[PDB]
Amino acid sequence: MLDFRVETFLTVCRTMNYTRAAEELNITQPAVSQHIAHLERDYGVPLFAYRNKKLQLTDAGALLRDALST
Amino acid sequence: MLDFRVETFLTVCRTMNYTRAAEELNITQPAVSQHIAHLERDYGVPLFAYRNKKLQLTDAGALLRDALST
Numbered sequence: 251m252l253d254f255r256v257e258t259f260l261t262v263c264r265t266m267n268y269t270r271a272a273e274e275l276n277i278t279q280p281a282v283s284q285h286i287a288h289l290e291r292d293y294g295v296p297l298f299a300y301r302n303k304k305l306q307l308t309d310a311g312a313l314l315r316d317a318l319s320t
Numbered sequence: 321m322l323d324f325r326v327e328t329f330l331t332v333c334r335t336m337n338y339t340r341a342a343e344e345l346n347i348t349q350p351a352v353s354q355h356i357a358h359l360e361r362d363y364g365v366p367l368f369a370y371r372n373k374k375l376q377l378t379d380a381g382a383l384l385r386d387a388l389s390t
């Protein structure tokens with residue numbers, strides 16, 4: 251998995267806010283979402299989801315988060 | 321995630337055979353399966369599955385594999 255997709259995932263994982271991650275990364279939100287979308291399409295699992303209008307880290311998102319810090 | 325659970329996951333991921341992983345790790349198969357089972361219960365996603373009598377690495381298993389090598 252590519253360094254920059256990983257960096258975007260971790261930023262969104264940390265901010266829990268895509269537009270905020272984009273500002274931090276100095277890229278556009280759609281760019282942030284395309285990085286995430288590529289990982290989700292490549293691995294076939296969602297990493298984030300909205301539930302009742304609030305961003306959530308999925309079970310696979312949490313596994314990715316912890317694996318990256320090992 | 322604990323060093324030894326990670327090591328067991330990678331061994332099974334590599335051998336694609338639990339009894340073989342156990343022999344390699346010098347622990348019993350049920351021990352191997354308990355390590356894996358703990359990760360799967362903790363993260364809520366399966367890492368392996370049998371499909372038509374053959375061991376498979378799941379989508380989450382592949383994500384874990386690649387994340388651990390980053």
Ligand SMILES: [Cl-]
Binds near residue numbers: 266268305
């Ligand atoms: Cl958001």
Ligand SMILES: [Cl-]
Binds near residue numbers: 336337339
């Ligand atoms: Cl097996």
